[PDB]
Design a protein around this ligand. Structure first.
Ligand SMILES: O=C(O)[C@H]1CN(CCCP(=O)(O)O)CCN1
Ligand SMILES: *[C@@H]1O[C@H](CO)[C@@H](O)[C@H](O)[C@H]1NC(C)=O
Ligand SMILES: *[C@@H]1O[C@H](CO)[C@@H](O)[C@H](O)[C@H]1NC(C)=O
Ligand SMILES: *[C@@H]1O[C@H](CO)[C@@H](O)[C@H](O)[C@H]1NC(C)=O
Lengths: 198, 36, 31, 85, 378, 100, 50
C-alpha cells in the first residue's frame, strides 16, 4: 500500500505493479487524478514564482564599508583624489581612508569604464554628476542608492554679494519657480538619461 | 520550430545511435569474455 | 494580459482527432 | 503552440521510431512488430499504463535512455505551450 | 520656541506624578535627553484645554540642545494651541490676510525661533525668513500592502464545464469501440478499467487495437498539457492591483468613491496642490475627506478607511520602517526642504546657518538620522 | 564672444522676468573654483571677493568656507556624497521547493 | 521551471514607444536613425531646441 501510494503521487515511478487488486483497487486508482493535478499545480507555481536585491549599503556607516574582511571578495571603492571627498571622509572616517588610498583613479571616465568592466564594486563622487553619469550610461547597469541616503547632502544655489539688495527677491523668485512647477520640463530633457529600470 | 529543437534532436539521435552501436559491440565482447 | 481557457479551436482539434480515429477504425474494420 | 514549420518534426518522430524498431529487431541475437512500437509510443510520454519491458535483458536497458530525450521534449513542449498563450 | 507634534520628530508624552519623565537609553546606551514641554492637555478642540506640562522629545531636540549650547541660548519649548502649521484663512472682514496656527503665533511676537518640520513655501518666505534646511526630501504616497493570496478559485475548467462530460463520453466511446474491435479480432469492464488507468497511471492491463491504443495515448497528453498551460496562465498574474506610479497615475487623475484619498489640512501640501491649477476635479474630492491630524489620518489608513494618504515622505518612510504593514508608492515629486521660522529683524541668521552647516558637515546629521529616523527595515 | 547655453543660463533667463536687467557672463582662466591659499581666493570666489562679480552662478558647491565669505540663496539642484552600485541580476536565492 | 523562465521573454528588443523613448534620447552608432533633408521634419526637430 505504501509503495503504491508513493508511486502514484507522481508518475515517474518505474516499480509499479498493481495486479493484486481485482476491482476494489481499480477505484482506489482514481486518486492519481488528484495526484497529477497537484503535480501540475506545483510545477506551474514553481515556474511562475521565479520571475524577479538592488541596494543594501543604505549609507556609508554600515559595517560592509568598514569591514571588508567579513566577505571573501575584497571591496574596491573609488574616489577622485585632491577633491572635497577626501576632506569629507578624513573628518568622519579616519580609519576608512587607509583602505581607500589603495584604489585611486584619475578621471570620471576611468571610473565609468571600470564599473562597466566590473573592476570596482562601487564608486563615490558628487551626487549630481553620479546621477547624470548613471542616467546617460549604456545598459542601465549603474544607479545610485535610493534617495535620502546621502551622507552629506547639500545644494548649489547662486552666489551673491554680502549686503547686496538682491537676495530678498532672488530667493522669492526661486521659490516661486520651484513651486509653480517650472523645473519638470527642464528635468525631462536636460538631465534625464533613462530614469526607469527593473 | 527552428534550429533549437532540430539541433537538440540531432545531438540526441547521434548520441543514441553511437550508444547502441558501442553497446552492441561491447555486449558481444562481454559475452565472449564470459564464455571464454 | 489575458488568461482565457479552452476555446472553440480545442473542440475543433478534439473533433479532428476523433474523426481520424474513427477513420482508422473503419479502415481496419474494412481490411 | 509548437512546431511552426510543422513538416519536419512529425516525420522525425516517425523515422526515429522506425529506426528504433529496426535496431530492436537487429538486437535479436520480445516480438519486433508487437512490442517495439508499443514501447516507443509508451516511452515518449510517461502517462502510459500498459508498460511491460521484461523481455530485454541488457540490450534494451540502454535503449531505455531515450526516455530522457522524451521527457525533455515533453517538458519543453509543455513550457512552450504555457508561455505562448 | 513653539513646536508642532510630529511623531518621527517630536514624541509628546505625558509626564509622571513627580513632574518629570522617565529616564531611558537608546540602543547604543547613550542617555536620551528630555525637556519639559508646555502645551494643551487635549489636542482636539471643544474640550477643557489645560496648559499642563508635557515631556516631548525626538529628533529636533538634540539639534536644539546643540544650538543652545553653542549659541548661549536658553530654549523654552512650547506646543501649538491649534495643531496646524497655519496659512491664510478667511474670517469676518475677509479683506484681511492674517496668519493662524504656528505662523500666526510666530508673527504675534510671542514666539522668537521655531525648530520644527516646516516645508519651505514662497508665501511663508515673503513674511518669515528661513534658514538652511536640515535635509532634503519630498512627499510620497502611502498605501496598504496586504499579503498576496492565490485568487484562483476555478478548481475546474474556468467556463464550459461540459468538457468533463465530453471527455467522459470520449472514454466511453473508445472503450466500446475497443470492445467491438476485440469482437472483430475484454468482456465486461476490462477495457474501461484500462481506459481509466492509462489516464490515471496505476498499471491496469489485433491491429485495430494497436492504432486505438496509439491514438488514445496521443490524446492522453493533450488534457494534461492544456491543464498545465491554463494553470501557468492563471498563475502569471499580479493578484494585487498595480501600485501608484506617482503623481501622473491615471487612476489618481480621475477621482472616485472606491479609491478615496485626501490631504489633512491647508498645510504646505494643500498649497502645492493648489498652485498647479489643472486638476480642477481633484479638489472636488480631496476637500471632502480632510482630517484633523496626521496621526488620525494614518490611524484611519491602518483601519482600512482611506486607500491612500499624502504627506512628507520623511514621515511615511519612518512609519513604514517602524510598522511592517504600510508601504510607500511613487519615486518622488515636488521635492522641497525644511527650515527654521525666524523674523526678518532677528540677528541670529548667520550664526544659525553656520552652526547648522558645521553640524551637517561634522556628521551630526548622519548620527541623528541613524539613531532616530533610520531603524530596521521590513 | 561665445554662444552661451545651459541649465544655469536658462535659470538666469527665467529670473530675467523679474530682474529685467542686462547680464554679461565672464569666465575665470585661473583654476576652476579655488580655495583659501595664502589668504587669497581664486576662481568664482576670488572674482566675487574683489567686487568683480556682483552676482555669481556656476554650480559652485556649498562648503564651510564660502558661507562666511559670501551669501547664497536657497539651492535648487540636489547634490552631496553619493555611492554608485552596479545593478545585480535576479536569482532564485530564496529556498526552492520550500515555502517560497 | 527553468525552461518556462527562459521562454517567458521577448526575444526581439522592445519597440519604439514614441519620441520620448530613452534609447532615442541617447544617440549611438549601434542604432543609427536620421531624417532625409531640410524638409518640414527637420524644421520640426530643430524648433524644440532641447
Ligand atoms: O561646485 C563645485 O565647485 C564642484 C566641486 N566638485 C568637487 C569634486 C570633488 P571629487 O573630485 O569627487 O573628489 C564637485 C562638483 N561641484
Ligand atoms: C593629486 O595631487 C598630487 C600632488 O601632491 C599628485 O601627485 C597626484 O597625482 C594628484 N592626483 C591625481 C589623481 O591627479
Ligand atoms: C555667553 O557666552 C560666553 C562665552 O563666549 C560666556 O562666557 C557667557 O557666560 C555666556 N552668557 C550666558 C548668559 O550664558
Ligand atoms: C552671533 O551673533 C552675534 C550678533 O548677535 C555676533 O556678534 C557673533 O559674532 C555671532 N557668533 C559668531 C560665532 O560669529
Amino acid at each position: 500500500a505504501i509503495w503504491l501510494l508513493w508511486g502514484l503521487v507522481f508518475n515517474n515511478s518505474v516499480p509499479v505493479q498493481n495486479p493484486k487488486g481485482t476491482t476494489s483497487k481499480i477505484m482506489v486508482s482514481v486518486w492519481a487524478f488528484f495526484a497529477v493535478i497537484f503535480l501540475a499545480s506545483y510545477t506551474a507555481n514553481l515556474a511562475a514564482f521565479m520571475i524577479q536585491f538592488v541596494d543594501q549599503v543604505t549609507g556609508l556607516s554600515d559595517k560592509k564599508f568598514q569591514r571588508p574582511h567579513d566577505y571573501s571578495p575584497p571591496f574596491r571603492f573609488g574616489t577622485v583624489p585632491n577633491g572635497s571627498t577626501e576632506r569629507n571622509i578624513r573628518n568622519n572616517y579616519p580609519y576608512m581612508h587607509q583602505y581607500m588610498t589603495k584604489f585611486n583613479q584619475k578621471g570620471v571616465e576611468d571610473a565609468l569604464v571600470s564599473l562597466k568592466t566590473g573592476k570596482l564594486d562601487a564608486f563615490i563622487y558628487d551626487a549630481a554628476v553620479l546621477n547624470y553619469k548613471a542616467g546617460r550610461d549604456e545598459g542601465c547597469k549603474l544607479v545610485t542608492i535610493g534617495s535620502g541616503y546621502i551622507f552629506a547632502t547639500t545644494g548649489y544655489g547662486i552666489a551673491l554679494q554680502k549686503g547686496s539688495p538682491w537676495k530678498r527677491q532672488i530667493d522669492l523668485a526661486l521659490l516661486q519657480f520651484v513651486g509653480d512647477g517650472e523645473m519638470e520640463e527642464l528635468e525631462t530633457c536636460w538631465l534625464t538619461g533613462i530614469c526607469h529600470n527593473e | 520550430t527552428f534550429e533549437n529543437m532540430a539541433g537538440v534532436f540531432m545531438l540526441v539521435a547521434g548520441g543514441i545511435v553511437a550508444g547502441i552501436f558501442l553497446i552492441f559491440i561491447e555486449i558481444a565482447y562481454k559475452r565472449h569474455k564470459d564464455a571464454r | 494580459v489575458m488568461s482565457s481557457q479552452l476555446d472553440i479551436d480545442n473542440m475543433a482539434g478534439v473533433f479532428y482527432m476523433l474523426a481520424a480515429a474513427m477513420a482508422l477504425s473503419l479502415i481496419t474494420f474494412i481490411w | 503552440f509548437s512546431a511552426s514549420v510543422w513538416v519536419m518534426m512529425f516525420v522525425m518522430l516517425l523515422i526515429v521510431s522506425a529506426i528504433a524498431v529496426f535496431v530492436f529487431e537487429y538486437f535479436s541475437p520480445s516480438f519486433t512488430i508487437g512490442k517495439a512500437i508499443w514501447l516507443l509510443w509508451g516511452l515518449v510520454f510517461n502517462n502510459s499504463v500498459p508498460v511491460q519491458n521484461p523481455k530485454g535483458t541488457t540490450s534494451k536497458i540502454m535503449v531505455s535512455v531515450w526516455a530522457f530525450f522524451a521527457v525533455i521534449f515533453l517538458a519543453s513542449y509543455t513550457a512552450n505551450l504555457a508561455a505562448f498563450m | 520656541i513653539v513646536t508642532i507634534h510630529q511623531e518621527p520628530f517630536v514624541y509628546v508624552k505625558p509626564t509622571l506624578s513627580d513632574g518629570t519623565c522617565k529616564e531611558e537609553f537608546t540602543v547604543n546606551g547613550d542617555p536620551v535627553k528630555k525637556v519639559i514641554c508646555t502645551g494643551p492637555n487635549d489636542t482636539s478642540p471643544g474640550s477643557p484645554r489645560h496648559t499642563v506640562p508635557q515631556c516631548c522629545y525626538g529628533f529636533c531636540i538634540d539639534l536644539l540642545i546643540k544650538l543652545a549650547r553653542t549659541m548661549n541660548f536658553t530654549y523654552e519649548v512650547h506646543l501649538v494651541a491649534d495643531g496646524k502649521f497655519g496659512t491664510q484663512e478667511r474670517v469676518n472682514n475677509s479683506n484681511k490676510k492674517e496668519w493662524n496656527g504656528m505662523m500666526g503665533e510666530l508673527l504675534s511676537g510671542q514666539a522668537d525661533m521655531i525648530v520644527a518640520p516646516l516645508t519651505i513655501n514662497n508665501e511663508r518666505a515673503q513674511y518669515i525668513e528661513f534658514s538652511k534646511p536640515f535635509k532634503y526630501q519630498g512627499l510620497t504616497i502611502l498605501v496598504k500592502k496586504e499579503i498576496p493570496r492565490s485568487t484562483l478559485d476555478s478548481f475546474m475548467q474556468p467556463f464550459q464545464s461540459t468538457l468533463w462530460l465530453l471527455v467522459g463520453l470520449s472514454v466511453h466511446v473508445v472503450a466500446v469501440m475497443l470492445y467491438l474491435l476485440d469482437r472483430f479480432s475484454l468482456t465486461l469492464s476490462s477495457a474501461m478499467w484500462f481506459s481509466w488507468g492509462v489516464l490515471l497511471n496505476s498499471g491496469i492491463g489485433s491491429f485495430s487495437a494497436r492504432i486505438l491504443g496509439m491514438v488514445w495515448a496521443g490524446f492522453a497528453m493533450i488534457i494534461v498539457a492544456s491543464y498545465t498551460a491554463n494553470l501557468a496562465a492563471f498563475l502569471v498574474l499580479d493578484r494585487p492591483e498595480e501600485r501608484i506610479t506617482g503623481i501622473n497615475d491615471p487612476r489618481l487623475r480621475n477621482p472616485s468613491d472606491k479609491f478615496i484619498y485626501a490631504t489633512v489640512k491647508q498645510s504646505s501640501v494643500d498649497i502645492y496642490f493648489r498652485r498647479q491649477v489643472c486638476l480642477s476635479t481633484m479638489y472636488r474630492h480631496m476637500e471632502k475627506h480632510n482630517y484633523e491630524s496626521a496621526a488620525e489620518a494614518i490611524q484611519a489608513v491602518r483601519d482600512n478607511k482611506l486607500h491612500a494618504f499624502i504627506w512628507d515622505s520623511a514621515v511615511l518612510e519612518f512609519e513604514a520602517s517602524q510598522k511592517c504593514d504600510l508601504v510607500t508608492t511613487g519615486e518622488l515629486f515636488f521635492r522641497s526642504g525644511f527650515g527654521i521660522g525666524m523674523r526678518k529683524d532677528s540677528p541670529w541668521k548667520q550664526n544659525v546657518s553656520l552652526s547648522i552647516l558645521k553640524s551637517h558637515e561634522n556628521g551630526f546629521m548622519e548620527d541623528l538620522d541613524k539613531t532616530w529616523v533610520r531603524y530596521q527595515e521590513c | 564672444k561665445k554662444c552661451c547655453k545651459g541649465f544655469c543660463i536658462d535659470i538666469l533667463k527665467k529670473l530675467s522676468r523679474t530682474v529685467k536687467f542686462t547680464y554679461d557672463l565672464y569666465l575665470v582662466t585661473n583654476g576652476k573654483h579655488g580655495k583659501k591659499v595664502n589668504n587669497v581666493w581664486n576662481g568664482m570666489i576670488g572674482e566675487v571677493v574683489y567686487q568683480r562679480a556682483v552676482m555669481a552662478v556656476g554650480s559652485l558647491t556649498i562648503n564651510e568656507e564660502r558661507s562666511e565669505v559670501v551669501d547664497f540663496s536657497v539651492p535648487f539642484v540636489e547634490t552631496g556624497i553619493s555611492v554608485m552600485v552596479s545593478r545585480s541580476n535576479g536569482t532564485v536565492s530564496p529556498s526552492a521547493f520550500l515555502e517560497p
